Design a protein around this ligand. Structure first.
Ligand code: CLA
Ligand code: CLA
Ligand code: CLA
Ligand code: CLA
Ligand code: CLA
Ligand code: CLA
Ligand code: LMG
Ligand code: UIX
Ligand code: KC1
Ligand code: KC1
Ligand code: DD6
Lengths: 185, 160, 70, 172, 161
């Protein structure tokens, strides 16, 4: 029951009531043994911004997944071009402070991210509910039924959280070590 | 879930995993569209890999300014970096048009390989069942072959 | 207008239901007749007259420096 | 069921200010919702003025960098320094004066369409000429104008940026 | 539509490639296109034969720049040497000829009916009208093939003839 976004937006806005569930019935607790309704601090008690929290978590997990993949892969293969060669930028963490500025690439990526995020800012502020959350209508290969949708949502959430933590210890493991994909000493 | 093409004498339903869970009408729609299009691309790429050797490579210029006589560039890896980027752009633009002239979303004729090309039809004698099973099986073989020659090229360094 | 908002407000009433796809143009609803009336004010009209006179004197002084033709 | 979505941005409902306009029934691309905060008539006027200006500017750059030059010794300057040599020469101020007259009358058009003194459509100035009589033909022609204008806006932006970066003619 | 047009050789309705399956709008569009093409071809072939038969290149095309009527080669070499705004003004006169009145479907311009009126077939005789327009169409087609062949001859040989 994905509730196609056109009819899903009918219940958008900042919901003022409380569903009585965990964080507004969001998929994601869904642990191995039972449900890990984590929320120790209590941000989910702030029920009206629970969809905001889900949107933030999904965006962070997606950016993470991409970033972990994008500091794992370049340590093996680089983009054709002298500025990206293994000799011009010896390490992947150097790639940030290697192009920047007037070299072009990183500034272009920042510019396009800014454009695509400004264009999708109307999705976060307004047109954001419990069900929509991170739904940017890129479903396509989103399986039908209902439990399959829950399984794919929890897969996305677990992979995103795992990638956030992994990227954290990865940029950390590379600054203190300066090594390829296995960032052990 | 068997009758809509893809079934032939060597094996009717070959899927240990992937579609293992069965059902999933939309999932099979997208998977069948992917299989058909992948088979078409693999057929074209295999033919473009055999033509430079079975047939004389194009004696023209490809890039008249840069003199790309079609023989200096190889067949396989490297030719991606050898064909000019301003020509790869037009190749990808033809791909872009052929994948955006008609729809390809769920419920559309696009997720069937139906893009209004026809030509190699039959007389509508329901032997188009045979022709479309040929589509699927021939594309499966062509894709096994296309990645096989991909590897062959990469591991041997050059075309073979 | 139960929510206290100032006079001449382009703000929609903040007491709305679930997110509304509505058009709320934030630009002043000015009027061409009103703008012409405002530019005809005694302060505006007479300051414009003073600016025109001063600039005319400036140009006369520039193209005819000093009183050479006295 | 409701909330007609943007065919361009499929996760944002189409702005109701876009209804009845040329580019809404097929694209409806207003993700930032400018039409929700700004008058859509003014936005369409700005878009069409920009598109026409850029469509003239693109071919002007093409001509100037292809050797198409007026018969004058002062006119033998490259496109990069064209809008310094012509500024000092005078014709830039002359074009400014005439375009200022045209834009004053465009201002009159805008400040008469908003008060209802005319049934003028945003981009309309009365030039029918190559204008279909059938309404569908009119809509398709307006869509062609808009798409060409947007394409030439982007094209001229790229042309000027690349020419300033790498001084070349146009194919680069 | 087999009874429309000219068909001077008679019994020569030629869809060949089955171009017109039957649609009045598309046929009228192509008829306007063909009549305009024929007029252009006849005018161009005249402006191509005239510089050779009667040379008659008196004076400078550009008194300021120095472009002389007698220095522009006849044929395709003309579009590098006819002055810049000279070509601009030729284009502008074509624009005047095509934009003075309406050529949109539903108007006389879509049928080729223009404001020239330099033959004035005298409506009391609406039979020489068909002859005049049929001759115009056939001559336009003949000069069409002629002018494209002349351009190809210019390209291949290196000069006009
Ligand atoms: C958070 C996402 C993210 C960000 C910010 C970056 C940022 C960067 N990447 Mg990168 N990358 C990513 C994801 C990301 N990547 C992923 C998922 C892959 C796997 C396909 C790669 C594979 C990759 C390679 C192979 C190379 C880079 C390189 C770079 C640097 C130069 C830009 C460039 O050419 O990128 C190119 C990026 C792509 C071709 C893939 C982008 C796919 C997007 C994320 C979808 C820049 C610091 C280059 C570099 O200097 O080495 C560090 C380089 O050679 N990246
Ligand atoms: C959850 C994934 C994960 C995994 C598998 C590891 C695994 C490892 N970490 Mg690690 N780490 C992680 C997350 C993770 N870390 C996070 C989230 C941080 C904080 C940003 C760190 C900060 C960190 C430091 C500071 C160090 C390690 C080190 C190590 C290695 C001992 C080992 C390979 C050590 C190392 O580099 O090897 C000795 C080390 O000094 N980690
Ligand atoms: C892009 C690849 C692709 C895709 C999407 C499909 C899709 C499909 N095939 Mg199929 N097939 C393919 C390639 C593919 N095929 C090839 C190459 C062969 C030749 C062996 C076959 C042979 C075949 C038979 C004999 C049958 C199907 C059937 C089906 C349908 C049901 C099974 C299913 O949903 O699987 C979903 C798709 C997949 C599980 C493929 C995903 C790829 C997996 C996950 C990894 C594969 C890795 C590969 C082996 C190694 C590549 C090298 C790598 C190491 C770099 C479905 C439409 C059945 C059918 O028609 O039903 C009526 C059927 O009976 N296929
Ligand atoms: C001067 C620049 C400019 C302006 C003012 C507009 C104005 C407009 N465009 Mg537009 N457009 C432009 C350039 C511009 N365009 C270019 C270069 C492209 C090519 C990518 C497009 C592609 C485009 C599409 C595909 C669509 C529009 C649409 C619209 C209308 C609704 C969008 C809106 O609220 O305002 C937009 C406001 C701005 C762009 C101001 C610039 C803001 C920057 C910071 C509006 C009349 C939609 C439409 O037709 O509505 C009926 C629509 O579907 N535009
Ligand atoms: C946005 C529109 C635009 C703008 C701002 C300019 C601006 C300029 N053009 Mg230009 N031009 C344009 C469109 C434009 N052009 C078009 C559409 C053409 C094709 C007819 C030309 C053909 C053209 C030539 C041949 C020359 C210029 C030149 C110039 C420069 C001096 C002004 C002048 O004499 O123009 C003259 C413009 C025309 C005679 C035609 C304009 C008429 C259309 C309708 C506009 C100046 C940088 C001159 C220069 O000094 O270049 C370095 C020059 O020699 N332009
Ligand atoms: C499609 C129609 C067409 C086109 C594009 C041209 C184009 C041209 N003619 Mg031309 N011409 C035409 C019809 C045409 N003509 C006809 C019908 C006649 C017979 C009266 C002539 C008689 C003619 C002469 C006598 C001369 C030209 C010349 C020229 C060239 C210089 C511009 C000029 O003086 O124009 C003149 C255009 C007209 C008088 C037609 C109105 C230019 C390439 C000159 C040249 O140097 O030729 C290479 C030249 O001296 N033309
Ligand atoms: C938008 C386009 C930006 C215009 C550039 C800024 C204008 C500018 O610098 O003005 C510069 C121009 C004059 O520009 C000066 O002109 C001198 C002529 O003596 C010089 O020769 C040069 O052209 C230049 O220095 O100023 C004006 O023309 C502004 C008035 C325009 C009025 C148009 C309305 C007509 C009624
Ligand atoms: C000198 C030297 O030797 O170096 C050589 C090395 C070598 C290897 C020989 C070379 C070669 C040959 C090549 C290029 C061989 C081809 C490699 C390919 C095609 C890689 C793409 C894989 C894409 C996949 C698996 C997509 C998979 C997508 C999947 C599985 C989708 C999976 C889904 O989960 C998703 C996403 C949603 C689910 O709901 C449904 C399912 C379908 C399960 C080189 C590169 O030339 C150079
Ligand atoms: C009728 C329209 C048309 C024209 C008129 C045209 C003309 C030129 N094409 Mg082109 N083309 C298509 C259409 C047209 N091409 C299509 C549908 C495809 C299939 C996708 C295609 C493929 C390629 C490729 C692969 C290359 C290519 C190029 C050139 C080139 C060289 C100029 C130069 O080198 O100076 C010129 C003049 C080569 C390149 O270098 O482009 C700069 C290059 O490699 N084209
Ligand atoms: C009554 C209005 C009128 C005037 C007053 C006028 C005047 C000049 N015309 Mg023009 N003209 C038309 C109208 C007028 N022309 C018309 C209806 C056409 C038919 C398309 C036409 C055609 C051409 C061509 C083909 C050329 C041309 C040019 C010049 C020129 C030289 C300037 C200079 O030498 O500085 C001057 C003074 C020649 C050129 O030299 O431009 C640099 C050039 O090649 N004209
Ligand atoms: C979709 C649509 C249309 C469309 C479209 C199209 C074609 C849209 C395309 C838009 C497009 C093409 C937008 C450009 C982006 C390029 C950017 C931002 C460049 C970045 C470049 C940057 C930031 C520069 C980087 C560097 O300079 C630095 C920083 C210093 C130098 O040392 C190094 C370099 C040079 C690298 C129609 C058909 C027109 C209308 C229709 O209705 C709707």
């Amino acid at each position: 029951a994905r509730r196609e976004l056109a009819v899903a937006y009918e219940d958008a806005g900042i919901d003022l009531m409380d569903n009585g569930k965990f964080a507004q019935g969001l998929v994601g607790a869904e642990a191995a043994f039972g449900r890990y309704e984590f929320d120790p601090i209590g941000f989910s008690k702030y029920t009206e911004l629970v969809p905001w929290f889900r949107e933030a978590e999904l965006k962070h997990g997606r950016i993470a997944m991409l970033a972990w993949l994008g500091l794992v892969v370049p340590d093996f293969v680089r983009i054709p071009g002298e500025a990206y060669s293994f000799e011009a930028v010896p390490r992947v963490i150097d790639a940030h402070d290697a192009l920047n500025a007037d070299a072009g690439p990183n500034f272009q990526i920042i510019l396009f991210i800014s454009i695509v995020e400004l264009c999708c800012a109307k999705k976060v502020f307004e047109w954001n509910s419990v069900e929509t959350a991170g739904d940017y209508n890129l479903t396509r290969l989103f399986p039908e039924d209902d439990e399959a949708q829950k399984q794919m949502r929890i897969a996305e959430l677990k992979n995103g959280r795992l990638a956030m933590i992994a990227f954290g210890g990865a940029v950390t493991q590379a600054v203190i070590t300066g090594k390829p994909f296995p960032w052990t000493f | 879930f068997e009758n809509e093409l893809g079934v032939q004498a060597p094996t009717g339903f070959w899927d240990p995993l992937g579609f293992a869970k069965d059902g999933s009408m939309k999932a099979f729609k997208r998977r069948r569209a992917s299989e058909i299009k992948h088979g078409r691309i693999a057929m074209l790429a295999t033919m473009g890999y055999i033509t430079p050797e079975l047939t004389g490579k194009f004696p023209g210029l490809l890039s008249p300014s840069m003199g790309l006589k079609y023989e200096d560039i190889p067949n396989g890896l490297g030719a991606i970096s050898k064909v000019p980027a301003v020509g790869w752009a037009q190749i990808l633009a033809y791909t872009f048009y052929c994948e955006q002239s008609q729809d390809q979303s769920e419920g559309s004729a696009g997720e069937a390989g139906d893009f209004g090309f026809k030509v190699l039809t039959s007389k509508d004698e329901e032997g188009l069942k045979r022709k479309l099973n040929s589509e699927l099986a021939n594309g499966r073989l062509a894709m096994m072959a296309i990645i096989g020659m991909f590897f062959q090229d990469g591991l041997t360094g050059s075309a073979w | 207008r139960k929510i206290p908002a100032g006079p001449y407000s382009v703000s929609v009433e903040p007491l709305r239901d679930g997110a509304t796809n509505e058009v709320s143009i934030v630009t002043p609803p000015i009027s061409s007749e009103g703008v012409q009336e405002y530019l005809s004010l005694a302060p505006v009209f007479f300051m414009a007259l003073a600016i025109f006179t001063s600039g005319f004197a400036i140009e006369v002084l520039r193209f005819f420096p000093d009183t050479r033709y006295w | 069921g409701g909330y007609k979505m943007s065919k361009a941005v499929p996760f944002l409902p189409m702005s109701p200010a876009l209804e009845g306009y040329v580019g809404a029934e097929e694209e409806g691309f207003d993700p930032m919702g400018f039409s929700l905060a700004l008058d859509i008539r003014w936005l369409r006027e700005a878009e069409l003025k920009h598109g026409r200006i850029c469509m003239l500017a693109t071919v002007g750059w093409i001509a100037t960098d292809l050797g198409m030059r007026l018969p004058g010794p002062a006119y033998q300057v490259s496109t990069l320094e064209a809008h310094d040599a012509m500024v000092k020469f005078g014709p830039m101020a002359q074009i400014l004066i005439w375009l200022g007259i045209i834009e004053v009358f465009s201002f009159l058009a805008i400040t008469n369409m908003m008060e209802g003194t005319t049934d003028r459509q945003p981009g309309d100035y009365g030039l029918r000429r190559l204008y279909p009589k059938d309404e569908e033909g009119q809509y398709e022609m307006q869509l062609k104008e808009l798409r060409n204008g947007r394409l030439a806006m982007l094209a001229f932006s790229g042309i000027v940026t690349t020419a300033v970066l790498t001084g070349r003619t146009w194919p680069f | 539509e087999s009874e429309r047009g000219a068909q001077p050789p008679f019994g020569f309705w030629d869809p060949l490639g089955l171009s017109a399956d039957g649609d009045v709008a598309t046929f009228k569009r192509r008829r306007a296109s063909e009549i305009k093409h024929g007029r252009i071809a006849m005018l161009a072939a005249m402006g191509y034969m005239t510089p050779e038969i009667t040379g008659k290149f008196p004076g400078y095309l550009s008194p300021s720049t120095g472009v002389k009527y007698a220095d522009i080669p006849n044929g395709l070499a003309a579009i590098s040497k006819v002055p810049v705004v000279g070509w601009l003004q030729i284009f502008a006169w074509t624009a005047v000829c095509e934009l003075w009145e309406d050529q949109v479907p539903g108007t006389p311009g879509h049928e080729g009916e223009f404001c020239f009126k330099a033959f004035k077939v005298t409506s009391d005789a609406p039979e020489t009208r068909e002859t005049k327009l049929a001759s115009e169409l056939a001559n336009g087609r003949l000069a069409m093939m002629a002018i494209i062949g002349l351009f190809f001859q210019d390209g291949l040989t290196g000069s006009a003839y």
